[PDB]
Design a protein around this ligand. Structure first.
Ligand SMILES: CCCCCCCCCCC(=O)OC[C@H](COP(=O)(O)O[C@H]1[C@H](O[C@H]2O[C@H](CO)[C@@H](O)[C@H](O)[C@@H]2O)[C@H](O)[C@@H](O)[C@H](O)[C@@H]1O[C@@H]1O[C@H](COC(=O)CCCCCCCCCC)[C@@H](O)[C@H](O)[C@@H]1O)OC(=O)CCCCCCC
Lengths: 516, 625
């Protein structure tokens, strides 16, 4: 059998290496080669998805090799429905981010003229590491790449990006790396516990073996040790997926980085955190996850409402979008930890829809910010008159993030909310208030920016706000199309997500509560 | 054979084209939108005829298109239920929207972006059709939020006007509060029944408990308040008038406001088993009817007065619906008649505004009766329907609603009847004031206004709407045709006849006559003042919409801003503060330790001789200390 996942994750990295190795004089050719690598990765993802059988075994396209037996970790890849969803999201988004950031690195000087090549290579490396993390079926391999993906993104923020890029990159890398190091403590504890248990020949990192051992009850561990390990994993994923109050790194990095890099971070990269909760936290520590479910549920709900409120209070458009994304990750984690088929399937579909919707909205806001010279909300006005298409696409993206039923995110949010209510009705209502808060922070921003009299310098002056160029349409139209398709007909995604979710719940001894 | 879902497909597709074709379709897009609306009307008429050709349970058409959200026990399948109740709304929406599109042809003829406006109109029609046709509450929610979005877009039209944008935002936010309430309702429904479709919900409706059913009904009533513009969510109607007059006509006559009443009636099984929810609905309907009637009497703008009248009529319909099956059929009939005559009135008002150089103040207008004979006739027909002259459509519907309210019985019945009578009187007073200030008295025109008759395109819709306001009410009430039609789906009911029908009719006529006489004395016998006269505290309170906006600005805007500032301070000082404090502690400790690196070899040797610490630790390791 062909090692499809190995190629899937290797192609982005090899392409990044080739791109960075290109001479300085091939900048345009470097851009086209990076786009071609992204498209090849997307084709690999497409064939994997097409061959994926949701009715078949839980894990498919499994590749297994000995990598570091001394550490009890093997090169084990395999994609489930949950992993496949995020893999498809990353594969589809990365080319769109590349064609969105086509010229983001143009103005950067020095670096032996490799600025464009460096930017493209870093983006492709992030894509490859994210993909391999998604497909990895080994705790230590997954941790390796979950932590490694930070560095390319750290360079991508610090290099390129705004004036305060350095501080933002430092805060990013240090928050995420402190979390990853706590994960390292938890992972070493997991290895030690597995070694001390007769369930395994020795200390083990094979995710499937450990999951089976814990589910069968053979790998019984002291609930305190399991609680500590789960706390480490959850803390790492909570800094990665911006669970409140650990979110404070995300706004600065998102605003200071280039729009494509910021989207890659929030839309794609940060998802690895939430996915990490869904695959490991629940399945490695079902008892600890169940015990801590109230606390994590409360934190997710507070994140939803608090991020919505802050987004309402923001004056910078991009920071507003970042806080919106924080609230959306709040929804994702709330749906994950409620441990309901509806809740978890909705959270996965929400990972997908939020990736797409935040990508669209953030990229459109980035285009608008590039047209002008300031990110301030008050710096704009009546933009709809000058750039009808830009304003229309921004409205559609906001409506998506606003969770309209005609667009994909609602389907997920609904599904999450439903799942939350059956177990924690008060939390469900508290989250549902975010439906109002999202209308607020989307439509008020639209009113402030696109409506009213055309602000000075928007339709005239040296930096007028011209409508979207064809390339920006190439970026935007696919995202809006995915939003509309996953809103009208989400079933193709759910058909893949629902089985994997069931297998997950079956694994953790959880079931949707019976109706009264 | 024509499937039901075409009703949704024809308009939406049109909108899609008009949204995507862009400037290429700017020259003829309005024609395509009008064609889509007319095709929807034709399909609705054909489906209604097919339902008439069927009897009993065969009358309704249930069609499941595809599995939609098959997640575990949810298993929500996209499906449309065009029942006897649904078909009435389908016909009303399609016909009135087609007439409004035809009118908008001329109304938006001189304004660019008419193609985009018609795109929004088609999307609005599609959303309303999906709302009324969806066989499950999730599809109902989809249509609900679609109607909210379309209302935002249309009210938000003419984005260069800040007031229009603010009105659109306010409308969407208030609608979204009711949408959140309806979302809580759906979550409760799924949690308790495990199903979302109408069929399963109503099959399991008898179970659960009075408390659960009351909670569901109250949340649905909150949603309706959102759409139906019932208190406390009734404040957004007034500002929504910044949008084009056809938008106001479409919103108030069908779809947007009609959605709350449709949700209440379609949810009839829940409210029938939830007496407390029905009581809440009745209270809301009466209170909002009174509030709208009071506010309308003070509004000096034709659009604002019409909006207040729409709020009052929706309140009457909501009270009828909350009265249970006794008023459900009467509520639907009054809703249809209101669609007709309110649409006519809004079209007439738009014609007046166009003739008056977009003037909206009722004080500036006057003596227009001769100036716009066709507009005057249409406005007068709609006015007679709204007041409820015996020949007019509104007479029968309002009389039935009032009779049901009075027959509710006991203190509740007496209160409802008194509220209805006061509402009828105040409605007569306000409508007479508006009509007199508009079409009677001195011209009072300003800026050398030169009124001209509206074109045929905007006129024919006016004549048809007047014909509807004249006929539909009787056509539905005489012989109880509408009541019998809704009987198979809406709860059947007998007549309590607490008071003779002629007695209630006479009382209503007397109240209307008293209001008309008061209005004539105030504004017909006495010349209409050119400036806003002073008055009692109540007059200014009504001028400020009974402070409804101020309350919202007083409690939620101000309280919301306070909460936002508090959370921003928490983020900047508390949350980020912990990381800042950690960094400060690390830096301070690093500096303190670096001070230990004194640079003197002898200090380092002293630290090394601190190896006495290692020696003592090793020795004590066996001391067991
Ligand atoms: C259960 C949860 C319920 C919570 C719902 C509350 C939603 C948010 C309320 C504020 C809002 O909704 O948004 C107003 C501002 C921007 O205000 P705006 O600038 O947009 O407009 C202003 C206008 O200023 C200029 O605005 C432009 C030019 O700038 C021009 O066109 C205008 O003519 C004008 O000159 C003008 O001068 C100012 O005095 C006004 O404040 C204008 O807004 C005004 O809001 C008021 C409130 O509205 C609402 O729906 C609230 C009611 C909805 C629910 C209440 C009842 C439900 C009960 C259920 C049982 C209305 O009276 C009009 O809506 C009016 O329009 O947002 C913010 O601060 C948000 C800050 C924190 C919000 C977080 C809330 C938790």
């Amino acid at each position: 059998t062909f090692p499809w996942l190995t190629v899937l994750w290797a192609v982005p990295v090899v392409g990044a290496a080739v791109v960075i190795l290109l001479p300085a004089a091939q900048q345009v050719l470097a851009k086209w080669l990076a786009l071609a690598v992204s498209v090849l990765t997307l084709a690999v993802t497409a064939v994997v998805a097409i061959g994926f059988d949701p009715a078949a075994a839980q894990y498919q396209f499994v590749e297994s090799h000995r990598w570091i037996p001394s550490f009890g970790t093997g090169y084990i890849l395999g994609v489930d429905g949950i992993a496949l969803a995020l893999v498809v999201l990353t594969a589809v988004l990365v080319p769109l981010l590349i064609i969105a950031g086509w010229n983001d690195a143009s103005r950067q000087t020095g670096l032996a003229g490799r600025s464009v090549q460096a930017y493209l290579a870093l983006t492709l490396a992030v894509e490859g590491m994210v993909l391999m993390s998604l497909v990895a079926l080994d705790i230590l391999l997954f941790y390796v790449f979950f932590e490694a993906m930070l560095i390319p993104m750290y360079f991508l923020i610090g290099g390129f990006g705004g004036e305060n890029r350095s501080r933002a990159a430092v805060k990013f890398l240090l928050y995420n790396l402190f979390g990853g190091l706590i994960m390292l403590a938890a992972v070493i504890g997991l290895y030690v516990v597995t070694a001390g248990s007769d369930a395994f020949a020795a200390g083990t990192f094979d995710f499937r073996e450990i999951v089976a051992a814990v589910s069968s009850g053979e790998f019984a561990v002291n609930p305190a040790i399991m609680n500590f390990l789960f706390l480490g994993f959850m803390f790492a994923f909570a800094v990665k997926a911006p669970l409140w109050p650990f979110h404070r790194w995300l706004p600065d990095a998102a605003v200071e980085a280039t729009p494509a890099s910021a989207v890659l971070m929030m839309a794609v990269m940060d998802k690895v955190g939430t996915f990490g909760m869904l695959r490991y936290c629940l399945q490695l520590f079902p008892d600890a996850s169940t015990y801590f479910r109230p606390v994590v549920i409360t934190l997710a709900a507070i994140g939803i409402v608090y991020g919505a409120v802050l987004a309402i209070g923001q004056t910078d458009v991009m920071r507003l979008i970042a806080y919106t994304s924080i609230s959306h990750f709040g929804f994702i984690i709330l749906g994950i930890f409620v441990m309901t088929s509806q809740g978890q399937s909705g959270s996965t579909l929400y990972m997908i829809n939020h990736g797409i919707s935040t990508a669209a909205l953030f990229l459109i806001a980035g285009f608008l910010v590039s047209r002008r010279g300031s990110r301030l909300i008050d710096s704009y006005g009546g933009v709809q008159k000058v750039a009808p298409v830009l304003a229309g696409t921004f409205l559609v993206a906001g409506l998506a993030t606003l969770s309209l039923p005609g667009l994909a995110p609602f389907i997920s949010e609904f599904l999450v909310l439903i799942g939350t209510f059956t177990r924690y009705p008060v939390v469900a209502v508290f989250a549902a208030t975010a439906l109002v808060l999202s209308a607020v922070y989307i439509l008020w921003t639209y009113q402030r920016m696109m409506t009213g009299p055309v602000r000075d310098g928007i339709g005239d002056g040296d930096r007028p706000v011209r409508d979207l160029v064809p390339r920006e349409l190439v970026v935007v139209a696919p995202l809006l199309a995915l939003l509309l398709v996953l809103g009208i007909y989400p079933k193709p995604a759910l058909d893949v997500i629902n089985p994997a979710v069931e297998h997950t719940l079956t694994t953790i001894g959880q079931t949707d509560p019976e109706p009264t | 054979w024509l499937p039901v879902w075409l009703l949704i497909a024809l308009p939406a597709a049109g909108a899609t084209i008009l949204l995507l074709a862009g400037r290429r379709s700017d020259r003829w897009g309005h024609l395509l939108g009008c064609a889509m609306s007319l095709a929807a009307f034709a399909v609705g008429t054909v489906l209604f005829a097919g339902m008439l050709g069927r009897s009993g349970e065969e009358r309704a058409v249930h069609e499941a298109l595809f599995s939609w959200v098959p997640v575990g026990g949810l298993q929500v399948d996209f499906g449309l239920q065009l029942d006897q109740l649904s078909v009435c709304f389908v016909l009303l929406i399609t016909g009135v929207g087609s007439l409004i599109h035809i009118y908008s042809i001329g109304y938006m003829a001189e304004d660019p972006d008419r193609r985009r406006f018609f795109a929004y109109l088609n999307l609005f029609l599609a959303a309303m059709l999906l709302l009324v046709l969806a066989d499950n509450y999730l599809g109902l929610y989809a249509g609900w939020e679609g109607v909210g979005l379309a209302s935002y877009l249309l009210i938000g039209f003419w984005s260069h006007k800040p007031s229009a944008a603010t009105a659109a935002k306010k409308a969407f936010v208030v609608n979204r509060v009711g949408d959140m309430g309806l979302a809580i309702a759906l979550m409760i429904m799924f949690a308790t029944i495990g199903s979302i479709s109408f069929a399963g919900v109503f099959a399991a409706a008898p179970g659960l408990s009075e408390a659960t059913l009351s909670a569901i009904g109250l949340l649905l009533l909150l949603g309706a308040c959102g759409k139906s513009a019932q208190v406390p969510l009734q404040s957004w109607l007034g500002d929504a008038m910044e949008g084009p007059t056809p938008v106001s006509a479409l919103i108030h006559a069908a779809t947007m406001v009609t959605a709350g009443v449709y949700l209440i009636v379609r949810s009839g099984p829940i409210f029938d088993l939830a007496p407390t929810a029905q009581t809440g609905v009745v209270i809301v309907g009466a209170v909002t009817l009174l509030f709208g009637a009071i506010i309308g009497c003070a509004k000096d703008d034709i659009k604002k007065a019409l909006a207040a009248s729409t709020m009052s009529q929706i309140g009457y319909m909501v009270l009828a619906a909350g009265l249970g099956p006794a008023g459900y059929a009467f509520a639907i009939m009054h809703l249809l008649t209101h669609g007709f005559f309110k649409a006519g009135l809004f079209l007439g008002a738009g014609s007046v505004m166009h003739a008056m150089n977009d003037e909206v103040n009722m004080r500036r207008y006057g003596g227009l009766r001769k100036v716009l004979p066709v507009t005057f006739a249409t406005f007068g027909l709609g006015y007679l329907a709204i007041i409820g002259v015996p020949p007019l459509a509104g007479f029968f519907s309002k009389d039935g609603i009032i009779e049901a309210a009075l027959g509710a019985g006991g203190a509740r019945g007496v209160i409802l009847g008194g509220a209805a009578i006061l509402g009828a009187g105040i409605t007569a007073f306000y409508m007479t004031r508006v009509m007199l200030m508009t079409f009677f008295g001195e011209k009072r025109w300003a800026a050398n206004s030169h009124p001209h008759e509206a074109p045929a395109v905007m006129t024919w819709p006016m004549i048809l709407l007047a014909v509807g306001s004249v006929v539909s009410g009787g056509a539905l009430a005489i012989g109880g045709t509408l009541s019998h039609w809704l009987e198979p789906v809406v709860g059947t009911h007998e007549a309590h006849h607490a008071v003779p029908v002629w007695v209630v009719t006479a009382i209503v006529l007397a109240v209307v006559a008293v209001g008309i006489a008061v209005a004539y004395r105030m504004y017909a016998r006495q010349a209409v003042p050119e400036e806003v006269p002073e008055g009692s505290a109540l007059t200014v309170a009504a001028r400020r919409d009974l402070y409804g906006d101020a309350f919202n600005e007083a409690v939620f805007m101000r309280g919301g801003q306070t909460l936002t500032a508090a959370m921003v301070t928490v983020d900047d000082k508390a949350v980020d503060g912990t990381a800042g404090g950690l960094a400060a502690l690390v830096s301070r400790t690093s500096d303190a330790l670096r001070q230990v690196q004194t640079g003197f070899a002898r200090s380092y040797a002293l630290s090394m001789l601190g190896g006495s610490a290692l020696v003592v630790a090793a020795i004590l390791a066996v001391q067991l200390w």
